[PDB]
Amino acid sequence: MDQETRDQMKNAAAEAKDNVHDKIQELKDDVGNKAAEVRDAVSSTVESIKDKLSGGSSSRASSYTLE
């Protein structure tokens, strides 16, 4: 992706780990540990078509996370 990694990857993930992963690590860290990775799954789908499909990747594009 492009610029969405820095802004979205770092933030979106952050809020997903603090929300679903906070409860998980504590309780679900074994199995339920997926519920978190899930929140980021859907988000990634957007953040992908948004910045990478945006039309041109030059800023932050040096970072690959979503895909």
TrEMBL record:
Bias-annotated ranges (Basic and acidic residues): 48-57
Disordered: annotated segments: 1-22, 37-57
Protein name: SHERP
GN (gene name): sherp2
